[PDB]
Design a protein around this ligand. Sequence first.
Ligand SMILES: C#CCN1C(=O)[C@@H](C)N(C)c2nc(Nc3cc(F)c(O)c(F)c3)ncc21
Ligand SMILES: [Cl-]
Length: 316
Amino acid sequence: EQFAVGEIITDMAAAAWKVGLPIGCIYLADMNSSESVGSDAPCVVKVEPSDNGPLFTELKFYQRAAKPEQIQKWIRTRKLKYLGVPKYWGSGLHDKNGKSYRFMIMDRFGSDLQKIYEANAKRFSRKTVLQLSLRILDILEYIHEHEYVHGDIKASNLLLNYKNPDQVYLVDYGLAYRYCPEGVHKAYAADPKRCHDGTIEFTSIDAHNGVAPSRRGDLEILGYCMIQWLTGHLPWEDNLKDPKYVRDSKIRYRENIASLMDKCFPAANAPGEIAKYMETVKLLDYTEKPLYENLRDILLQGLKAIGSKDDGKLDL
Ligand SMILES: C#CCN1C(=O)[C@@H](C)N(C)c2nc(Nc3cc(F)c(O)c(F)c3)ncc21
Ligand SMILES: [Cl-]
């Protein structure tokens, strides 16, 4: 028990918070007041031993790229409805029982997409998949432009806004990677300070080859998520215990995207924007910056094809 329930904690900027019950070491949190922290709390507090490396990595990302006005400024200038990076509210050090703990205050959210995906018998519609992926491309553009890649996009790292079910957020930056510190892209090689390969069914070819993740990796990961979400499957899913097999199929299907479309979708009935998406991500060099707006225009053509538009509705 890192906290006394209902106690007041003070972050290093002197902002006061009350700590609440744990959710479903993450506790509900709110601003300091005479009211207690309830079920509808707007924040969470994450706490870990101060020697926990992932929370320090995640904390530094949030400090650098997730300041509330930093996000709000981007939303206005890029003319967006919202932006699915969670907001950083504060952090500090907390000693209890002769042990040191690091804590971090963040937005609270509703359900993860993996639970909702499983509740639909492992299918999201083409409307949902295009609408989700457009907003992830906005998220990925943002974090990429602030020198980070996520490396682990998947439904269970996608949380709905608690008070708005058409807003999705990308969470979990504990094994995120600073690919571009001070504008200097990392070279095509391994990084000994890291050793996360991703989640095996969705990770990039780069990651399978043991090099540090980069921007094209994230778009590749999203590509595989799109097919998983549309079809309920990935070709290599019955052999996840062998990373050699999974790298081999991914490399082979990268070289022949039509055979991936034929393998995953019913014969002569595959969504053209997905194939077109994969083909564009294929062209990217390791260090290259994606043309994010063209990737979104590709997914926009798809919404046009199904008699729809980017109206922000995820339809969950
Ligand atoms: C109650 C409840 C709902 N609820 C859940 O069911 C599960 C899916 N989780 C994990 C939640 N996470 C958060 N915040 C969060 C913020 C961040 F910034 C993170 O990086 C992060 F990992 C988590 N808020 C609420 C939930
Ligand atoms: Cl104490």
